[PDB]
Amino acid sequence: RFSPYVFNGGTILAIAGEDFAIVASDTRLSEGFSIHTRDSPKCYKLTDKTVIGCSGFHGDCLTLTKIIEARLKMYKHSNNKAMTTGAIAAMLSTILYSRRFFPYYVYNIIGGLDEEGKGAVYSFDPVGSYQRDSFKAGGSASAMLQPLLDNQVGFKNMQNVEHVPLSLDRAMRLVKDVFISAAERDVYTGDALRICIVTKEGIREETVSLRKD
Template identity: 45%
Template sequence: MTKQHANWSPYDNNGGSCVAIAGADYCVIAADTRMSTGYNILTRDYSKISQLAEKCVMASSGFQADVKALQKVLSARHLIYQHQHNKQMSCPAMAQLLSNTLYYKRFFPYYAFNVLGGLDNEGKGCVFTYDAVGSYERVGYSSQGSGSTLIMPFLDNQLKSPSPLLLPAQDAVTPLSEAEAVDLVKTVFASATERDIYTGDKVEIVILNASGIHREYMDLRKD
């Protein structure tokens, strides 16, 4: 079985894959820990997940200098928000802030492909998926990065999110339990690692629920 060299930019120094799944009272966000450029692995233990607020986490693939710059801007604006409002920003508010931040840079965009996950004001899981210039959508699950073309068809087959065009609108959160969602994430990463040379080494899984945030790790193929 041969791995494929995905159609990924030569300016990218971190392909990899990010996945997020929203549930009724939880959200699971995961990303692999490999940082590579071309056929060279720079490090096998690099976290692509950043906690932006108490109930909001972002996973990013793409050019890591741009990802770090984006995280610094969001962190600074969140700090200003906390001083002005004396509270943490909600996940939907952070989703709008991320969209605005990316859109301001649309003529010289951040080379970062993001998925944002967390809990909304009602305690429900929420996932927001983005393109490079800030267009975003709230979905039940999403994937970004070089492995997303392998992962999304599998998630579509397993989760079958309702169409946003349905009337009356249906809730997009997935019907899986938290443990089932974590197992599904592990399965899709094991699958993507077999075919995508930029995804591998280890997967970091962040789980948000009413009791807080905790992390799990699982080893992947290292070749």
Template identity: 45%
Template structure:
């Protein structure tokens, strides 16, 4: 019986020891690695208006150079009381590893539903943003490999957009883009939404130039910007394309629009 637990390789067969790690033919140590993550491509963005929010994402799902599906939504309604989420007022977009994104979406949705049942009122977008940060931070040692953006209307009806890193750090912004083409879309949004590097023509030279006054964009202007942003992204990035899913949050509810993008 003692031979079963013996460390003697003669009596108990070959044993593994970290002091005698397996090596390759040329004498180098063989590396063991477990990587549970994958990047499934796609991009998302959100823009906050005076009394609305637009959250959008493409529908392409990739693994490297392979397209797994052309219809993988990345924008979801959160906290509704029905299976169709028709009464939801908060929208979450996730991009990156879609298995983690789906898990994060389901968990936040469950939290918002429990809040509704316990308190008899919908959760506010500010409270939901804080709760999402807590969920992400609770998984910081094995984080959700996902870039999340939360959108909704705050208590006074103003559009609110919150962006996150994978471990829960977040901030409220006027606009944010993320995902595979985030670095392509964000400079465009900085210029067109945040009015960076926009000056009044003929107002001077060099530092004397007057910056253009920041004015709220209309819903029509924002929708056109979103479409232009993704039209540009699909021309330069193979992991973005197929369809554009847009959700517009207003005091009347959430409207969903789906328009085609390039499929090559």
């Protein structure tokens, strides 16, 4: 038994704001007990309005993102407009299901703006189950990240707190904290955090150092 899969690690995260989206990932690429490289981000630019995060089996991450790139140009050629964030998510669902009986071993989170200019996150399973979310963690350390987000962004289990809108600064401070906390415990998550911020002005990039052990 040759196995066509191997786990290469990676943690991804997206947050939807009122007028922004964040997509964040660590930069470590692993195999077994080893590090392949410390500088392999998992975020990919799709359009001026849409970014995708991918982790899992790296062979599939590469193949799937190249397929998505080709499908975006084909769409643009047939229809004379860029694919919307929502249309990309709907398409990705069908691409993932096309391999239902030999899946892309990939966890995908799309972050971008929708047609009204608002933050949009869509999260996927490997065979294309998806929905829209306010925020979502995925990949290696998702079980470490998600609960704190449920608590701090969703205001869950909290009494007597005003459910205020999520500012970019606070969203940003959260993204850094959950990854730093994940880096303490998940052996796959480390090296550096890469953050993409999608706004009407475009896509900008912050990077924060994580533990190298």
